[PDB]
Structure 1
Amino acid sequence: LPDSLTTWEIQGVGISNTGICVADTVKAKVFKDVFLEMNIPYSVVRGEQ
């Protein structure tokens, strides 16, 4: 998967001599519970605390 919270919705398809076939939309929501994110700045200068 991709480390990135979101509810993925994955739907394939299969077209073959018999016809096209829309398979069954399969959902996969990533994590929840309790997480953490960080606010790291673009730049910081040596000697800065």
Structure 2
Amino acid sequence: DEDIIAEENIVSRSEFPESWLWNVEDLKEPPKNGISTKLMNIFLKDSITTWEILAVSMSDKKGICVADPFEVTVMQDFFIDLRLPYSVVRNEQVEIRAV
């Protein structure tokens, strides 16, 4: 606004998991040529990477089948990357970097 943007009123991305959406889903839509369609909504995480989604189906009349991998890309324009070591020794000089 009237003041140049300082660093007091910005939220920070926090969620950095490695595997999510460990759910189970059921299909009961009325058939249409034997193909039932279900619509689901998902809220993406706060990482900049490529997520891979895999699904496995197991019915009672056909058996078991495995779907194909699906890829979703999350991307921004200007951002920050932080690289940290796994563990740090107490009471010793340490250097970290931000890109």
Q: TM-score band, normalised by the shorter chain?
A: 0.5 to 0.7
Superposition TM-score, scaled by structure 2 size: 0.33
Root-mean-square deviation (CA, aligned residues, Å) is 1.9
Of the three residues 69, 74, 82, the one matched with 1:25 is: 69
Q: Deviation at 1:8?
A: 0.2
Q: Please give the per-residue CA displacement for 1:14-44, whole angstroms capped at 9, x wherever unaligned.
A: 1112111111211012115432357xxxxxx
More strand by share: 2
Q: What is the aligned partner in structure 1 of residue 59 from structure 2?
A: 16
Confirm or deny that 1:6 pairs with 2:49. yes
Given residue 63 of structure 2, which amino acid in structure 1 is its aligned partner? G
Bigger relative CO (Cα 8 Å, ≥ 6 apart):
1
| Structure number with larger C-alpha Rg | 2
User: Aligned letter for 1:31?
Assistant: M
TM-score, with structure 1 as normaliser: 0.58
Flag as ranges the 4+ runs of structure 1 deviating above 3 A.
none
SS at match of 1:31: coil
Give the aligned residue type for 2:49: T
